[PDB]
């Protein structure tokens, strides 16, 4: 059947017979195909949404027509018509019945093959690798004969087979026989043609582009080089807007489908880095809300990732971190914005998972970082009560979330929590309790600024003297401001930009007054006023510690 189908596929492009005269008359009728399609759709949707429990030790103790449709007839004809470089029949068929792509994966791979050949010569012209093409050579066989060195080349031979992808099986190289299958196609000459033909091939391959990671990398590097080419010119914002739209519509849905493949997402984010962060948040949130639902394969992948993330999260321990950390890092780096939210909730209301997560942030790349900051702002802004139901006591999640944020600022130094600090500087205006709490924990954990509530007279005396006596006193009072100079400088640098220092000092001060003018039980009023006072004092101690010389008089 293979050779016969190949002969018909050859004949079916030199005009011997028209396509539909073959399509309409092969075995599986269109109705039986549609029935199989509905069955696959329902089974897939159920196994996605509900899910299935894989039995590990369950019950292990006490006390053919599918193969037919897949392997022959219409589907096999489509696969081969695609391999042999005749793209227009299959484009016209899949334009009508898109669901056909669910039947088998190989259609997406082969379509990606023809598209990648179409795009390769445009890709080499940019991101120039041609100057670097001259390094793919083999080592010469060296042998010592009669006490002298002798070099020889390795000898291989060439075989022709029916498999489309080339290979080299340990002595000999195999190639596709029909060596002029690429006669009817012309590669791209300019990125504009890349857009014009993306609108045809990629809109067909759909969310399944993820099945071929290499295409993601190639398109993203083309984008990076195209944006870099005109850094000087005035029209840069035009190209930025156009690539924004492109990445929104064709690539990001695809990268949402990947499976434990960090580097591809690293490339897509290396392209995304050029946008305003407003746009990145737009894309991330739309993908979260409207495109996870209402699209089948994306929904399946999101549900699989989420269930897997919860399964791993139930098994984090002080003893199993050595491998669970690597697995969680891969899973979070590949598909973050749907596998992070369960983790964010689990650390929102459980004790030690917070320390475990802050330990395992050491491993994931910039994409996981941006998405993590996103979901942090998400949770911080979700609609829910801040104070506890009982009385004026604050709820039991603010504290654990603030501890998490402080641990982030302390351990992983490539986090870029700038937007969170803009959240603080903004929402302090209205007196949000979460702002004050995050500020307190940030100052006390990262900076190391312990308060002066309980101090014996001798320590209090040493605490203002020459430098070494003061250092000994501070290390006695369990204060570690000296050893944390670098990270304190980094955080005060985050604060320095957008000139938040004076605004924050004035805000804290004029907030404690409004706290003085509220009405409640005195037993809480006195404590609140004093707590705010101590917070302000500690903040100013940090500021004087980190900003000295002229920077102080500049930004204070």
């Amino acid at each position: 059947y293979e050779r016969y189908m190949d002969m018909c596929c050859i004949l079916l492009k030199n005009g011997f017979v028209n396509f539909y005269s073959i399509w309409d008359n092969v075995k599986p009728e269109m109705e039986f195909l549609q029935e199989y399609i509905q069955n696959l759709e329902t089974e897939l949707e159920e196994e996605s949404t509900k899910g299935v429990e894989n039995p590990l030790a369950m019950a292990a103790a006490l006390s053919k027509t599918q193969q037919d449709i897949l392997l022959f007839g219409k589907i096999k004809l489509l696969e081969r018509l695609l391999i042999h470089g005749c793209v227009i029949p299959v484009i016209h068929v899949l334009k009508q019945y898109p669901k056909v792509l669910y039947v088998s994966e190989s259609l997406s791979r082969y379509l990606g093959r023809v598209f990648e050949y179409l795009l390769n010569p445009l890709y080499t012209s940019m991101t120039s690798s041609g100057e670097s093409k001259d390094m793919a050579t083999a080592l010469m066989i060296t042998r010592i004969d009669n006490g002298i060195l002798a070099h020889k080349p390795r000898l291989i031979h060439k075989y022709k087979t029916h498999e489309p992808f080339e290979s080299l099986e340990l002595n000999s190289s195999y190639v596709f026989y029909y060596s002029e299958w690429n006669s009817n196609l012309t590669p791209f000459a300019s990125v504009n043609d890349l857009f014009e033909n993306s609108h045809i091939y990629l809109s067909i391959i759909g969310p399944y582009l993820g099945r071929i990671p290499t295409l993601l990398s190639k398109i993203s590097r083309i984008g990076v080089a195209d944006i870099q080419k005109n850094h000087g010119s005035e029209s840069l914002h035009v190209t930025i807007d156009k690539w924004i739209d492109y990445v929104r519509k064709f690539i990001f849905p695809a990268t949402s489908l990947l499976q434990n493949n960090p580097i591809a997402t690293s490339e897509v984010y290396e392209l995304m880095k050029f946008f305003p962060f407003e746009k990145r948040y737009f894309i991330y949130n739309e993908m979260m809300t409207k495109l996870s639902q209402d699209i089948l394969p994306l929904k399946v992948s999101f549900n699989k990732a989420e269930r897997e993330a919860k399964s791993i999260l139930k098994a984090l321990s002080i003893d199993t971190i050595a491998k669970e950390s690597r697995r969680f890092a891969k899973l979070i780096s590949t598909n973050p914005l749907a596998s992070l939210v369960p983790a964010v909730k689990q650390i929102e209301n459980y004790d030690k998972v917070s320390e475990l997560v802050v330990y395992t942030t050491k491993y994931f790349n910039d994409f996981a970082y941006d998405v993590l900051q996103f979901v942090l702002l998400l949770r911080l802004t979700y609609n829910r009560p801040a104070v506890q139901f009982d009385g004026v006591n604050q709820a039991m999640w603010v504290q654990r979330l603030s501890i998490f944020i402080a641990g982030l600022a302390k351990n992983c130094p490539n986090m870029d929590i700038s937007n969170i600090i803009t959240y603080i500087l903004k929402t302090l205006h209205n007196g949000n309790i979460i702002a004050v709490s995050i500020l307190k924990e940030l100052i006390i954990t990262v900076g190391g600024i312990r308060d002066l509530n309980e101090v014996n007279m001798k320590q209090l005396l040493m605490l203002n003297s020459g430098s070494p006596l003061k250092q000994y006193a501070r290390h006695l009072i369990y204060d570690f401001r000296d050893d944390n100079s670098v990270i304190s400088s980094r955080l005060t640098s985050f604060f320095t930009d957008q000139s938040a220092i004076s605004e924050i000092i004035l805000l804290l001060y004029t907030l404690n007054l409004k706290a003085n003018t509220q009405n409640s039980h005195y037993k809480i009023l006195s404590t609140r006023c004093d707590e705010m006072n101590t917070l302000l004092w500690s903040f100013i101690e940090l500021i004087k510690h980190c900003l000295k010389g002229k920077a102080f008089e500049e930004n204070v």
Partner: peptide, 26 residues
């Protein structure tokens, strides 16, 4: 978008206080 629509600036923190003098009618 809402929490990013709040106006932030030195002109708004002034919120001038009440003078110490308190008039006469836990």
């Amino acid at each position: 978008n809402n929490v990013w629509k709040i106006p932030t600036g030195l002109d708004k923190i002034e919120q001038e206080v009440k003078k110490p003098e308190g008039v006469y009618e836990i």
